[PDB]
Symmetry: C2
Subunit: 49 residues, 2 copies
């Protein structure tokens, strides 16, 4: 039988672990360096004669 092979691993390095920063919906907002707001919006108008 082909069976699922698991290699021997070393303890987790703290430097590898990023996941604590984005495991919740609010965190995915915290991770933004700038949030979209209404006043950032500029709407083009094409004015006819």
């Amino acid at each position: 039988m082909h069976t699922a092979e698991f290699l021997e691993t070393e303890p987790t390095e703290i430097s590898s672990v990023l996941a604590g920063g984005y495991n919740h919906p609010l965190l995915r907002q915290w991770q933004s360096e700038r949030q979209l707001t209404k006043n950032m919006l500029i709407f083009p108008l094409f004015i006819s004669d």
Copy 2:
């Protein structure tokens, strides 16, 4: 009479003119690198036993 003295001046240097960036209420918002939103707020709670 003491009168108001005005020194002879040279034409404006373009490098001196910052004012075009903040002469309207919306611009003072444009000039912010980050705007305050509700989700940035964290409120402390002091829980009694």
